[PDB]
Design a protein around this nucleic acid. Structure first.
Lengths: 52, 1349, 140, 100, 104
RNA sequence: AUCCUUAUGCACGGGAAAUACGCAUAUCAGUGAGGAUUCGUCCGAGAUUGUGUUUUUGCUGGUUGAA
RNA sequence: UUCUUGCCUUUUACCAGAAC
């Protein structure tokens, strides 16, 4: 009812191959990889940041 | 009668209400109702109903009511059971209800018995125990039996035993396609045991040692109609332990010879075989058939009554402690003493063995050994078995003197039943009789009254009650009774069958294992008998002359059982699909025959039952099909195999395939060739099961032969070649095929297996019809493959059968590639959903619907049904009775005005054809006459569809068929012509389309209501139900051929027709082959990059020719080397087998050869790879690399050869530079290794790497030079000495990928003049797959359109 | 049962019952109080009613008392039940050949429930007819 | 919820006899393999194996020998032929003579 | 307890490496599907289970394969390999523990 | 200030299962629930009843069709 | 109406015999 955020699919390097909501998954394969790896890093980084 | 209870309940309630007409009384009444119900429930449970607050009078009344109910209820149940037994009449739920009620009462009795026992101690007085324990101990001593020890911690034959145990447990689930929860749990447990075998073993041994308290056993009562009970569902965890114990003790016992030769069932003899052996033994005693000196043989049979149900556990335990390690015995005792639960009514099994505990069979046998010993006496037992060091084969002896010593010639025991063959010299017999008389006075001579006799046989052939003989028999029985205590087993005279062979009684009788047997010697041969039909010829060992006949029948009890089974099958048909019912029937019939082989031909009652049973079964199906019963179905629908679309009933009757129901037709270019029709009869099972005598003689022969062969082999120093034994391979008992089965050495240890099988009736619920022959130890003792083949032949071959069905409707040319989706499978698929019972029922029904549709053209016809011949709405599909399912199917088929559409479509096609050939045939104009929407399905009248004007004039022929070569054009002249597109859904009677056309033309032209313009024209009739055509009418030169051509094309092509065909297929669930394995596609592309090991294979580059072509395209001829690109997309390895050009020198049919070569290479590669590194999925790029590859990959069945809808870009292995160079520079066949992802797997994922490769390769394929340029944009970025690709950084790589993508898309645009925007999905498709795209053909499009409208 | 299932008094009441259940289906047993078959049906329906309270309501009616509805069966008057939804009479094709009313006792509670469910479904769809999942033919 | 049968519990050993319709396809495939150039040898060997498995021990003998005779001259094929004839002495001897 | 107002909702529509496993246990698997397919003309491959011969092995075995022998190609799936209940698992663990204790 | 143990709370990540997970104005429960046992004793925390979902809840994406 | 046969599977209506 709020629509304050929007929940995006939590990709990984195993989901990488099967997630198609975010585009570029085969089109821009290395780009896609970067995005997914980057996302993962952010998640990890966020966790670490939170801890800090 | 069942209403009576209800009435009582109502009445009582009313009375109660009357008694209390108070305030707030309704509520009170309601409460009282519940109380009434609850009391009844309690009673049923056999719990007491002791309500504390309840006031006395009310309570009393309630009690009275329940008593009344009991009086009515129990009695009613009994009556119902009796009725069922009779085979009189009973409602399909009523029977079920009775079975519950009956079960409950059984429980009540048994539990009450137990209670009684508990109250008043064990029935065994200690003296008796002492006697019988003593007997056992002495026997053991005589045998010098080393007791069975506790399974050692590191037991030698332990693992094997465990495996055996697990397999038996599994066996029940192997068949079934779904699993409930309990079953699933059991399966899981089994798996665990398998997988952690050591752990499981430890658990089991621990349990044996220590577990003496157990999860309590449920007893679902069985459904053997003639007499129910019992099935004990033991806890799944305990079950494993039990199973192991059963395996182990039985093995151990067999090793140590615990059980004598006389105890049955043995692992060697199948029950018919056993019977045969017994008969032989009876024949083959010394001077048994001599009755000159007043001799009397007596063959006492009896059931040791209640044997299992009054095994005292203390005594039993003690007995066990003689033969097993005491701990094991204790465990067994504990297990037998469980809480037996049932639908809220428990008891505790303090007395009488539980039959369903896996070991229990062994225990039972052991118990019966005691009884056997008692029956025989120790000495006689010893004589029978022989010495311990060297025991006797069944019924043999060490001498003729020890055989003649005691009266008991032969002894045996099939479980509860025992069989003693006494032989008295006259005097002894007389003495015995006298003794009997003394003990038990007989003044009146009313002993022949009471005496049981084999009423199955004729009066003249059965045991004559010649008083002396009767007395002797009774005396013998008495003696036997005396020999055995009461408290171990009730041996009753009612259950006994004492046949007596004297001077007066020539036929010796007995009934072993369901066979009624009647021995008759040659020296008595001339009394009563026609010697042939249903017999064994008993031949003595010493003489080898035909000594005695042995006449067989199926025992009355067995016949009754069979009848019950048939009835059971019939009732519960409701949900049960026709096919399922048919299968059940087949199973029943096969069970009957394979077992009683020879004996069914004699026993007339059984035959009669079979006749009737089959008829009943047929009628069920008929009923399902239609409320009205048909005059006659064709046998086709029933006896035609499952696979052709029939039911596949295996007839046991003189069924007559009527000559009318063998006709058939075939639409060809030449015309419509017909066939019509000594007499044809559905072949009966009788001919196809080999009689038991033959089997046993055969067995004797072929085993000897086998032995001889073995000896020969030994002499010549060889293992016995299984190739030599072909001919007598599927012969003998056990079959010779057993000896060379791959699990021979494990099934050595599965001992006491027959008895285990027999005893599964108490553990698994749905009862096994092949209890007698464990295929693993015997082999296929029957083969009815021949029968199936013969049935087809009988029904004029496949074609004839099809011509009954709506097969040809589906519009397939041939039936080579087709397959059914089965009905059961369908049912299963939709029984994984949240469904209300109604839905489930509907689903269950659906398999019948399909069947009905299939046989529609020979269910729905005037010969089959008669009456209101109604027209199905909007179609020419006349029904012949509301075959409701069929009707529904038809409606589904011809939804969206399909018939009309078809007709109109055909008309349109015709018009088009006419237009195409105007000037050749002298046609002025072709006008499609506008018709009433209902014209396509006006079967009463008709009308012209396509009017046709002549340029000048047409000389037309006399009205004739479309395939008549002799046509004169001097008959009549005309300026105008017409065409009538007629349709009909024919049925087997009325499906000659040509004839129909002829008739209709004759009628509709002369009839005034059918308004055609000219008197000259043509009627093209298109039979939809058979996909046939014929045109009848007036022809003008050159037209007929054209028409024929159109017809040929129209049937192939016409979109409406195609749509109809598709619909029909859907209805039937027939489908064309295509490929069984699942295609790799955009959908399941993500499946490639899971943990399972895979290999892509490409044969595109194996035979390369080259025609060298530059950017201009100058010609230059050559033929270069090839390669077999085989890529692992996980690891990035590339097993590139370089095919050298020397292979193709002096070869022809080259392409085909190449494929084979590729396959071979692949196989080799697979072989090279170890079991760990081997592939699960060989993905193959090209379509038809499957077959050769499959052939070459039989040895690796774990490997699954997938095709792919992706036009995968490994074609561009030769676009890659280094690879190309290596291909060029190989001078021989050479396997080469490359990492196609040279570096990337340390940086990025495997999937990512693969994607990159796809991108690059695809680009290369699209435009090689361009791709190369893109790759080598910056010359600083160096390709390494051991790499295939330039070592980019990540950003650089991304850039490259982008460029590649652009190249791909730009190129696409250039080629296919398409806008470069599209969808992302589309883009993905273009890259990954380069797949066909959803490109439905024009025909397909048309079909779709038709469907829509 | 007499106590469990509500019984209706006069034709007006019956009519009201038929109309008023907008959400649920309405099962009216029309039957002479003291008859065997009718009694059996009532007993069956008592069981069903509690189960299917959420989708269909059961009511009983003494047919000799309330003679208003001898339009419903043309003065044959066996011991019947009738089905209604949104005041529209609901037709259920069994084998019987009277698609309008089941004028025969079915012994299976579960079966009865299933048929009720089917008719409810039909009503929801709007289908005036519905084909039963059980054939009958024998009872009639 | 009536769970699906644990896939790998499906029935494996002791099956029906191989159908004539079935066998024919296999034969055709093998013919194709053979006739579209000899392997050289293995195609014949494969066919022999199939026959053995099919099963058949007369037609195979007839055909395999013929195959061996004309085009190929490999040891493996000879060995296979020898194996096929467990008719102890004479045939085996003949085969040996042919081979060595 | 009342039967639920029968509405026939097909709302769900989901998937997920997570969810597709569970549903795999309740899916008919590919080999089962194959089995359910029966070749038309041919007599179909049965298996003679001693309990009952009835069983149709169906078209899970490839024609050629069937002609020759058997297959573990129809032993594909791991996602529906009969797992224990929570209770059952616990019980088994307990048993194992007991065994271990005995051994010591 | 560094290192570690325990529990919990938040989270990265990885795994299994959902036939499982709850809920209760319920009834009873370390003042003993439920179990073991070699019989000496031992373990010691839920049990009962009612009931809600449970081949699944919430959200997304695609093809498609629909036409 | 009840019991026994035979249509068979149901309504008639029967098949062919008993009992009230």
């Amino acid at each position: 009812l709020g629509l304050l955020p929007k929940p995006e699919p939590k990709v990984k390097l195993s989901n990488m191959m099967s997630v198609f909501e975010n585009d570029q998954n085969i089109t821009d394969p290395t780009a896609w990889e970067k995005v997914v790896k980057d996302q993962v890093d952010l998640r990890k980084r966020k966790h670490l940041e939170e801890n800090e | 009668d069942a209403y009576y209870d209800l009435e009582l309940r109502n009445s009582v309630m009313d009375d109660i209400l009357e008694m209390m007409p108070e305030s707030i009384r309704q509520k009170k009444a309601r409460t009282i109702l519940q109380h009434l119900s609850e009391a009844w429930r309690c009673w049923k449970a056999n719990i007491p109903w002791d309500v504390p607050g309840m006031p006395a009078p009310i309570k009393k009344i309630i009690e009275r009511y329940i008593k009344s109910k009991a009086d009515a209820w129990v009695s009613a149940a009994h009556y119902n059971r009796e009725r069922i037994k009779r085979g009189a009449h009973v409602e399909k739920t009523m029977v079920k209800k009775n079975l519950g009620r009956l079960t409950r009462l059984w429980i009540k009795n048994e539990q009450e018995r137990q209670r009684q026992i508990q109250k008043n101690g064990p029935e065994i007085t200690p003296e008796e125990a002492t006697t019988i324990f003593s007997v056992m101990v002495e026997w053991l001593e005589s045998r010098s039996f080393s007791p069975i020890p506790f399974p050692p911690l590191t037991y030698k034959n332990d693992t094997k035993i465990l495996v055996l145990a697990l397999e038996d447990l599994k066996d029940v689930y192997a068949s079934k396609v779904r699993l409930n929860a309990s079953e699933r749990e059991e399966l899981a447990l089994i798996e665990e045991a398998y997988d952690n075998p050591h752990d499981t073993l430890n658990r089991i041994k621990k349990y044996l040692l220590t577990q003496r308290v157990f999860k309590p056993v449920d007893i679902t009562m069985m459904e053997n109609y003639q007499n129910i009970s019992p099935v004990y569902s033991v806890d799944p965890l305990e079950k494993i332990t039990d199973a192991y114990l059963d395996q182990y003790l039985w093995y151990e016992a067999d090793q140590r010879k615990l059980f004598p030769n006389w105890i049955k069932p043995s692992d060697s003899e199948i029950p018919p075989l056993l019977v045969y052996k017994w008969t032989q033994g009876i024949n083959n005693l010394s001077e048994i058939w001599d009755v000159s000196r007043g001799q009397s043989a007596v063959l006492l049979e009896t059931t040791l009554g209640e044997m299992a149900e009054k095994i005292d556990f203390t005594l039993l335990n003690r007995l066990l402690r003689l033969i097993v390690d005491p701990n094991i015995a204790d465990y067994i005792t504990a297990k037998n003493n469980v809480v037996i639960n049932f639908k809220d009514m428990s008891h505790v099994n303090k007395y009488g063995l539980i039959r369903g505990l896996k070991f229990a069979s062994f225990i039972f046998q052991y118990y019966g050994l005691v009884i056997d010993l008692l029956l025989l006496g120790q000495e006689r037992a010893t004589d029978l078995a022989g010495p311990a060091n060297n025991p006797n084969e069944f019924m043999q002896f060490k001498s003729k003197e020890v055989e003649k010593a005691h009266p008991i010639r032969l002894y045996t025991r099939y479980l509860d039943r025992i069989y003693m063959l006494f032989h008295f010299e006259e005097d002894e017999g007389e003495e015995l009789t006298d003794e009997y008389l003394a003990e038990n006075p007989d003044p009146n001579f009313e002993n022949s009254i009471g005496y049981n006799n084999r009423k199955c046989w004729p009066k003249d052939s059965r045991m004559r009650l010649i008083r002396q003989d009767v007395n002797l028999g009774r005396a013998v029985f008495w003696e036997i009774q005396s020999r055995v205590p009461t408290s171990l087993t009730s041996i009753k005279w009612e259950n006994a069958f004492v046949s007596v062979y004297s001077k007066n009684n020539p036929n010796l009788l007995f009934s072993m294992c369901g066979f009624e047997v009647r021995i008759l010697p040659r020296q008595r041969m001339e009394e009563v008998v026609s010697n042939d039909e249903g017999v064994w010829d008993l031949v003595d060992e010493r003489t080898k002359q035909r000594t005695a006949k042995a006449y067989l029948k199926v025992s009355e009890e067995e016949i009754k059982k069979f009848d019950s089974r048939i009835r059971g099958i019939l009732m519960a048909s409701g949900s049960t699909t026709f096919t399922k019912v048919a299968a059940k029937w087949n199973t029943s019939l096969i069970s009957l025959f394979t077992y009683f082989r020879e004996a069914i031909v004699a026993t007339e009652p059984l035959l009669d039952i079979l006749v009737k049973g089959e008829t009943r079964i047929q009628n069920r199906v008929k009923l399902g099909l239609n409320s009205k019963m048909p005059t006659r179905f064709p046998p086709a629908v029933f006896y035609t195999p499952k696979e052709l679309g029939g039911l596949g009933m295996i007839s046991a009757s003189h069924i007559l395939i009527p000559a009318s129901d063998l006709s058939w037709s075939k639409q060809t270019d030449t015309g419509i060739t017909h066939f019509r029709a000594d007499e044809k009869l559905i072949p009966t099972i009788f001919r196809y099961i080999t009689t038991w005598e033959n089997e046993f003689l055969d067995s004797q022969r072929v085993w000897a032969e086998y032995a001889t062969k073995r000896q020969e082999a030994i002499q010549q120093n060889r293992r016995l070649a299984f190739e030599e034994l072909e001919g007598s391979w599927d012969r003998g008992i056990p079959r010779i095929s057993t000896l060379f089965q791959r699990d021979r050495h494990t099934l050595a240890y599965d001992r006491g297996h027959r008895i285990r099988r027999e005893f599964k009736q108490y553990s698994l619920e749905r009862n096994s019809p092949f209890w007698w022959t464990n295929s693993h130890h015997d082999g296929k003792l029957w083969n009815l493959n021949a029968y199936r083949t013969d049935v087809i032949q009988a029904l004029g071959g496949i074609e004839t059968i099809l011509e009954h069905t709506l097969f040809k409707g589906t519009g397939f040319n041939s039936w080579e590639g087709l397959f059914w989706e089965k009905a059961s499978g369908f049912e299963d698929s939709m029984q994984f959903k949240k469904l209300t019972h109604a839905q489930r029922t509907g689903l269950s029904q659906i398999p019948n619907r399909r069947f009905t549709l299939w046989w529609s053209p020979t269910i729905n016809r005037a010969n089959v049904y008669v009456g209101f011949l109604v027209q199905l709405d909007l179609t020419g599909i006349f029904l012949h009775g509301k075959i409701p399912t069929l009707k529904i199917s038809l409606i589904q088929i011809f939804r969206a005005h399909l018939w009309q559409k078809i007709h109109e479509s055909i008309v349109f096609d015709i018009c088009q054809i006419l237009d195409g050939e105007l000037d050749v045939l002298q046609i002025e104009s072709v006008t499609k006459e506008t018709v009433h929407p209902r014209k396509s399905y006006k079967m009463n009248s008709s009308a012209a569809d396509i009017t046709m004007e002549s340029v000048h004039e047409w000389e037309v022929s006399k009205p004739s068929l479309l395939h008549e070569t002799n046509d004169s054009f001097k008959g009549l002249i005309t300026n105008k012509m017409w065409f009538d597109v007629q349709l009909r859904y024919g049925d087997y009677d009325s499906h000659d389309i040509s004839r129909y056309v002829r008739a209709k033309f004759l009628d509709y032209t002369t009839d005034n209501v059918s308004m055609y313009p000219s008197p000259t024209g043509v009627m093209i009739g298109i039979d939809l139900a058979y996909n046939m055509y014929d045109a009848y009418g007036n022809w003008f030169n050159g037209l007929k051929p054209l028409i024929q051509n159109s017809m040929r094309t129209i049937m192939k092509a016409n979109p409406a027709l195609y749509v109809l065909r598709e619909r029909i297929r859907k209805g039937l669930q027939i489908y064309q082959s295509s490929v069984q394995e699942p295609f790799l596609n955009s959908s399941n592309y993500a499946e490639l990059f899971n943990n399972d090991i895979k290999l892509f294979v490409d044969d595109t580059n194996v035979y390369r020719v080259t025609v060298h072509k530059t950017f201009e395209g100058n010609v230059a001829t050559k033929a270069i080397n090839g390669c077999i690109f085989t890529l692992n997309p996980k690891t990035g390895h590339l097993f590139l087998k370089i095919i050298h050009t020397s292979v193709w020198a002096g070869q022809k049919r080259l392409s085909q050869l190449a494929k084979w070569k590729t396959a071979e290479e692949v196989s080799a590669l697979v072989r090279s790879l170890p079991k760990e590194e081997q592939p699960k999925q060989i993905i193959v790029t090209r379509k038809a690399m499957l077959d050769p590859l499959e052939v070459h990959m039989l040895d690796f069945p774990n490997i699954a050869i997938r095709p792919t809808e992706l036009r995968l870009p490994f074609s561009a292995a030769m676009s890659i530079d280094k690879l190309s160079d290596v291909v060029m520079k190989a001078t021989e066949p050479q396997m080469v290794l490359f990492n196609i992802y040279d570096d990337w797997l340390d940086r990025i994922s495997s999937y990512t790497a693969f994607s990159r490769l796809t991108l690059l390769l695809r680009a290369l394929k699209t435009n090689e030079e361009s791709a190369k340029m893109i790759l080598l944009s910056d010359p600083t970025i160096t390709i390494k000495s051991y790499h295939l690709w330039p070592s980019f950084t990540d950003e650089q790589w991304i850039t490259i990928e982008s460029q590649m993508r652009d190249l791909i898309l730009t190129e696409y645009g250039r080629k296919y003049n398409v806008n470069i925007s599209a969808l992302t999905q589309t883009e993905i498709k273009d890259i990954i797959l380069g797949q066909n795209i959803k490109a439905p053909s024009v025909k397909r499009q048309k079909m779709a359109e038709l469907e829509a409208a | 049962a007499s106590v469990l299932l509500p019984q209706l008094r006069t034709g007006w009441h019956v009519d009201q019952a038929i109309v008023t259940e907008t959400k649920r289906l309405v099962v009216i047993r029309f039957g002479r109080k003291n008859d065997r078959q009718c009694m059996i049906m009532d007993e069956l329906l008592s069981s069903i009613a509690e189960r299917v309270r959420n989708f269909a309501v059961i009511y009983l009616c003494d047919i000799d008392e309330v003679s208003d509805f001898d339009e419903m069966y043309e003065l044959t008057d066996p011991m019947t039940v009738m089905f209604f939804y949104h005041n529209k009479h609901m037709m259920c094709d069994f084998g019987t050949g009277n698609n309008n009313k089941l004028n025969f006792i079915v012994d299976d509670k579960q079966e009865m429930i299933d048929i009720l469910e089917t008719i409810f479904r039909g009503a929801r769809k709007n289908k005036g007819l519905v084909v039963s999942p059980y054939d009958y033919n024998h009872k009639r | 919820l009536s769970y699906l049968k644990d896939l790998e519990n499906d029935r494996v050993n002791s099956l029906s006899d191989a159908t004539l319709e079935d066998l024919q396809k296999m034969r055709t495939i093998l013919k194709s393999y053979r006739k579209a150039d000899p392997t050289n040898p293995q195609g014949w060997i494969a066919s022999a194996r199939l026959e053995e498995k099919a099963r058949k021990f007369s037609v195979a003998k007839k055909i395999i020998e013929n195959g061996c005779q004309e085009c190929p001259r490999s040891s493996d094929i000879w060995l296979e032929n020898i194996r096929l004839h467990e008719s102890d002495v004479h045939y085996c001897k003949t085969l040996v003579a042919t081979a060595i | 307890k009342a039967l639920p107002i029968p509405e026939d909702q097909p709302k769900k529509k989901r998937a997920g490496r997570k969810f597709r496993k569970y549903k795999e246990k309740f899916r008919l698997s590919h080999v089962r599907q194959l089995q359910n397919r029966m070749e038309f003309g041919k007599q179909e491959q049965t298996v003679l289970d001693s309990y009952g011969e009835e069983v149709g092995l169906g078209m899970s075995n490839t024609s050629l394969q069937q002609a020759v022998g058997a297959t573990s190609g129809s032993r594909r799936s791991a996602g529906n390999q009969a797992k224990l209940t929570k209770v059952m698992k616990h019980r088994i663990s307990e048993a194992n523990q007991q065994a271990d204790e005995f051994l010591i």
